[PDB]
């Protein structure tokens, strides 16, 4: 049973849905204030264009957001990765939705909207992604994650918006799609002696996992401000083929794919003919080790056409690892299935669990997913 998921508007689990649509009616006259908090905690929308405020989030998180099943590696998002992730085009400051100590103004929660077009099947939908949901450790199991899901909720609603999307690791009614974490070793010394990884030989091992210095792909290089367009009409065909997919803007593609250093990274490649036919991307997220920080680099969006997605993702691990990165993250959504296991991809432990709030639709297979969030 789920006390607070029982009553919000999402299918039940174990509910075969063969329908297409909204759970409930767009409500069409909202709630004006804001949700009650226990005593002693109020509101407040964070302006992350101020750096102390900025860093106050960052630290929240740094203490408090997301381990690792066994406890010994939280993320670390830079204060930089954080403006990335929650500034993009059409962000608005009552999204940024803060919980502080009444008495001393230390901030103790947070949750996060973005607005994105979502295709979902045949419908195409205005949506938030919700991201960066955080209770305090010393706030937790106090029912405060459910008031801060109700008052983004109405904070949407205030804008017109009635879906959204997410994820989390774990189960809630009613995942969408069921994703699973694997991880690609580049530097095993380092992910053994901090025990993320590990009949073998440490010298087997670096020989099982070593890569060439540069890539294979003919005119490999990084994405520039020229190759705007083209990313952006690359990745919107490219996205056709999947059943759960964001759908950008040309600003949209430039938000999220042109490189900036520490956060994201794209190359593409520019054929003999001066033509650009695929991409590559990663994001920078490390974690700190509990139980001082691990540099992995995250898959984010790759599009082939011409060039096979095996050796694309073999430049990604290349590029990853002359580029620092102790380990090289992907997902078995999208067309991943393909190389993972080619690539020497391990598989973890763990469930990355796919949501819609208000709309039902049929589950998917991970191969139809086609959306990737920070
Ligand atoms: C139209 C617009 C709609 C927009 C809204 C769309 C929905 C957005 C939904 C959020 C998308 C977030 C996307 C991400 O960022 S996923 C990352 C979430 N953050 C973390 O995992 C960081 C570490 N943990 C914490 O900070 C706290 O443990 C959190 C904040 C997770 C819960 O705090 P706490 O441990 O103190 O619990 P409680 O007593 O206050 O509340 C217990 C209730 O909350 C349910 N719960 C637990 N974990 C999650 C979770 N990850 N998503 C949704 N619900 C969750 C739980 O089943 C129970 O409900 P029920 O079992 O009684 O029913
Ligand atoms: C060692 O460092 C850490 C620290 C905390 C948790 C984890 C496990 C984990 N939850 N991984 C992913 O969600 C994940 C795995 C593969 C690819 C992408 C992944 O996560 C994305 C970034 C974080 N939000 C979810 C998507 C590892
Ligand atoms: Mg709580």
Not at 64 to 79: G, I, K, L, Q, W
Not at 246 to 275: C, K, L, R
Request: aromatic share 12%.
């Amino acid at each position: 049973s789920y006390q607070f998921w029982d009553t919000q508007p999402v299918p039940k689990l174990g509910e075969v849905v063969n329908t297409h649509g909204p759970v409930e009616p767009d409500k069409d006259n909202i709630r004006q204030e804001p949700y009650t908090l226990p005593q002693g905690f109020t509101w407040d929308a964070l302006d992350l264009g101020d750096r102390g405020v900025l860093k106050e989030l960052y630290t929240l998180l740094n203490e408090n957001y997301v381990e690792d099943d066994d406890n010994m590696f939280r993320f670390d998002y830079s204060p930089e990765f954080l403006l990335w992730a929650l500034r993009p085009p059409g962000w608005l400051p009552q999204w940024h939705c803060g919980v502080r100590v009444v008495s001393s103004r230390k901030l103790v929660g947070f949750i996060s909207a973005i607005p994105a077009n979502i295709h979902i099947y045949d419908t195409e939908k205005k949506m938030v992604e919700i991201n960066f949901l955080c209770v305090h450790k010393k706030l937790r199991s106090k029912r405060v994650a459910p008031v801060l899901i109700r008052e983004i909720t109405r904070r949407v609603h205030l804008e017109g918006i009635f879906q959204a999307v997410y994820t989390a690791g774990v189960v809630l009614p009613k995942p969408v799609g069921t994703c699973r974490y694997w991880h690609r070793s580049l530097n095993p010394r380092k992910l053994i002696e901090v025990k993320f990884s590990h009949n073998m030989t440490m010298q087997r091992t670096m020989k099982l996992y070593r890569l060439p210095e540069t890539p294979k792909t003919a005119g490999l290089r990084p994405m520039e401000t020229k190759d705007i367009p083209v990313v952006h009409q690359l990745l919107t065909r490219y996205l056709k083929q999947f059943h759960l997919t964001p759908v950008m803007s040309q600003e949209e593609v430039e938000h999220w794919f042109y490189p900036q250093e520490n956060i994201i990274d794209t190359f593409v490649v520019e054929n003999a003919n001066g033509e650009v036919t695929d991409f590559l991307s990663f994001y920078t997220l490390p974690s700190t080790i509990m139980n001082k920080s691990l540099k992995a680099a995250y898959s984010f969006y790759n599009v082939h056409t011409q060039t096979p997605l095996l050796d694309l993702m073999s430049d990604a691990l290349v590029l990853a690892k002359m580029k620092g990165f102790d380990v090289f993250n992907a997902l078995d959504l999208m067309e991943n299935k393909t190389f993972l296991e080619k690539l020497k991809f391990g598989i973890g432990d763990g469930n990355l669990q796919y949501y819609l709030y208000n709309w039902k639709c049929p589950s998917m297979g991970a191969e139809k997913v086609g959306l990737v969030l920070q």
